[PDB]
Symmetry: C2
Subunit: 491 residues, 2 copies
């Protein structure tokens, strides 16, 4: 669903500088008249391209699925997943690609050239034969330009791979070759798999510099996608970009994860969704936001109410290309706790909704010496300690001064949240237009114990993930399913 | 321009207009509405298509049964809008017989599956109704109802000019405000521009030009106004309709004449911009006409013009009169250069405009210059360039498109406060997706904003927003992201 192919994905001023040998403006112009298509994932790795008057246009069948031919709605919806579509440059030209996977049907990845709906081509297919550590590819891949001079599919190896290892896979966009496999150690002898990565570009040039990804073990890993040496003044320079830089890619912090997520009792919390990054308020480093949860196995269809899943905000203070041979080892104790303190039914204007209010505890980042005090925050997905097995499996959206996320609670029910990325708590401004006003105003606020407060969470209709768009008027909106909510990124 | 998708308004702006209604429920219901595009066909004929150019609907006015560039304008372009009547919100479509006959019609296009005929108006209903080339405006009035406000059109029975206020629900002529121009000279009121000066969604004034070049203003408020809240809705009701009248005691705000003293027809609707002093408004209007066959030919004998006239009595004042003005009281602006250049990798032929300041007041508040003007000509070369399309004023810029028969389209982004070059880049001529220095031009070894650029003549001016929430002006064939100003 979120995989629609209409206009060019980027703005020319951003894409063109990435590829001097190409012409994005002419590519963009061409796509202005491209026949829109929406590709949806099915049971296995099956792809059914069709939309706008829902006319079946295309259908793809993986070699693994084509040869084989020789629970619940919320859960099935997740399992079927959705392919990733993006614009990429290779073969000397811009293309619109679609990256899919065999889902739970098998261990495989595939990419299609979807630039011309009337002429979809198969770029490549990856299986265990090509990548021995490839597992069930539930992770959502990212398509990006890397410092090795080329575009690649960057994703986690997935789950239940042959040796239960976790690794970042960097697949050449054009060839499907494994440009680099960045294995992570983590805890051994215990099943692991790397999840959806979030690429970081810290000098706004369209070339990915770092990648962040959690794993089934709850480790939040960072990977350096830049050369060993540096240029110090501008460590993210493209000057030495080339195929050789690929060998320099490495797990960051000497192989130590930025963080290892465990619940209140100390039990590991799997991370499925991609992290989100927000520049730290001091402008030094970034706050890495990630939530825990897992939903790929049948057993996961049922709520695990033995522990709470959690949303974390961890300070990565070494994001300026420093060697970063290591990183602080943190625990919830080094973070500021936030809580979901109230769930209630209320009416905003005329619209009735069930909402949740979060705490608003400040985070004390530095002591007067300048040394680090709290390194972040956390929020257990539970209202006043009641465990319902609420978890995060969908990617989040960080914009302005807010982080938007959607959680799922297997019964499943969906809760959309708008939180302060700097604290993990309630924003000081109202985020959602819950009153269907067309704008974000006080009509959407809630009276929490004599206090007019911003609503941090609201329950929304059947699963649909979260998408950020702009309603005709320049106003940003966040949509899930059935409802889109005008949002306020902050003053 | 006549596309019917989601609700036209943001709820917080529409709801206050009709407390007895629920725009929220209306808007929600349209979120799922099947998008339709309505194209005004051969004068009268109206065809509806789906997002995928598919014959979905077609309307043939009783008039019909009663039995390249020039054709684009003469053909049509219906007006769609959300209006309130019958105690509910509806999406209406106002059509005109155009060159076919003399009449207007309104359709209820709220439900693409069940379109209804609201009403049809002809000379039988409105004797002074002429060929309906003027573009109507759907608006809420102080008489308590929504109405179709438009110019009576051209070559009407007695060639008179009048503002027509047509009840939205009934199609009845609520008021006909006749205007007195020059004797024996054929006249007709053109597309009006309604003004809402206290931003509550209820029109207060209407401005419209006529074939004689007069720019008229009409008071759409009660005669007995409360100086503390002249635009108040407290006394709204049918009793207010009788007080609607021609402003300034029957005198036009301005009478447009070319540099040689000849009258300049006004066909396009004016555009309003609050005066920098916050007192009054700058009434911007362009000159030209293209509804008659002879108009297909370029008139190279004179230069058409764009004017910015200061109306200093826009706060409910009785305004029994208005200053008699001429080019002499206005600051001139000129198009000093036209050249072909390349912005980024996109080739474009552009024009540079002067940037002469406007001196509005004396130390004691006395009025010096009452506006500005710009003759559509480069270095005095007359090509017959004229404005026949509505303009778009947003932020600190007025966007307009002129047509040069022979036809060639020129899109301009000018400073509304002076009619000259903006001090900032307006158009993204480099196809960067954003407006940056790549779109500026070196004028006399100085970076300066480009005020005009030639378009692939075939469309009009439409303002929209890109996926990134930024202003974008499209000209059928190409959209240019724009910068409304700092
Ligand atoms: Ca970079
Ligand atoms: Ca008003």
């Amino acid at each position: 669903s979120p995989a629609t192919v209409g206009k060019a994905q980027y703005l020319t001023y951003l894409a063109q500088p990435i590829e001097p040998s190409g012409n994005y403006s002419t590519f963009a112009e061409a796509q202005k008249t491209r026949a829109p298509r929406v590709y949806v994932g099915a049971n296995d790795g099956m792809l059914h391209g069709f939309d706008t008057d829902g006319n079946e246009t295309f259908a793809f069948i993986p070699s693994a699925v084509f040869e084989k031919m020789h629970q619940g709605g919320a859960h099935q919806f997740y399992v079927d997943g959705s392919p990733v579509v993006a614009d990429a440059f290779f073969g000397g030209a811009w293309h619109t690609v679609l990256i899919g996977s065999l889902r739970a049907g098998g261990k495989g990845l595939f990419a299609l050239d979807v630039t011309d709906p009337a002429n979809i081509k198969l770029l490549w297919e990856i299986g265990v034969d090509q990548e021995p550590d490839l597992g069930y590819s539930f992770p959502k891949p990212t398509v990006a330009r890397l410092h090795n001079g080329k575009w690649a599919v960057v994703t986690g190896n997935g789950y239940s791979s042959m040796n239960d290892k976790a690794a970042l896979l960097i697949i050449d966009m054009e060839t499907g070759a494994i440009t680099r496999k960045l294995e992570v150690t983590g805890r051994t002898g215990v099943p692991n798999g790397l999840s959806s990565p979030r690429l970081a570009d810290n000098n706004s040039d369209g070339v990915a510099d770092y990648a962040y990804a959690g794993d089934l073990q709850g480790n939040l890993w960072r990977f350096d996608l830049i050369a060993g040496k540096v240029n110090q003044d501008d460590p993210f320079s493209r000057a030495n970009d080339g195929p050789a830089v690929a060998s320099s890619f490495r797990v960051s912090f000497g192989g130590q994860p930025l963080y290892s997520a465990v619940d209140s009792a100390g039990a590991a919390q799997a991370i499925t969704a991609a992290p989100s990054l927000v520049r730290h308020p001091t402008r030094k480093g970034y706050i890495v936001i990630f939530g825990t949860g897992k939903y790929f196995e049948n057993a996961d269809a049922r709520a695990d109410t033995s522990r709470a899943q959690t949303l974390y905000g961890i300070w990565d203070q070494q994001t300026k290309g420093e060697a970063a041979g290591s990183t602080p080892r943190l625990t919830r104790g080094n973070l500021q706790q936030q809580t979901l303190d109230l769930q209630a039914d209320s009416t905003f204007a005329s619209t009735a909704r069930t909402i949740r209010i979060a705490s608003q505890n400040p985070v004390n980042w530095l002591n007067n010496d300048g040394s680090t005090k709290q390194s972040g925050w956390y929020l257990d997905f539970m209202v006043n300690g009641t465990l319902k097995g609420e978890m995060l499996i969908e990617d989040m959206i960080a914009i302005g001064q807010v982080v938007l996320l959607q959680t799922i609670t297997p019964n499943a029910s969906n809760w959309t949240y708008g939180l302060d990325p700097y604290t993990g708590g309630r924003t000081s401004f109202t985020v959602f237009d819950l009153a269907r006003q067309g704008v974000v105003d006080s009509k959407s606020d809630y009276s929490y114990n004599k206090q007019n407060v911003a609503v941090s969470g609201t329950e929304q209709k059947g699963l649909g993930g979260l998408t950020l768009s702009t309603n005709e008027q320049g106003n940003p909106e966040v949509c899930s399913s059935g409802e889109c909510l005008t949002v306020n990124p902050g003053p």
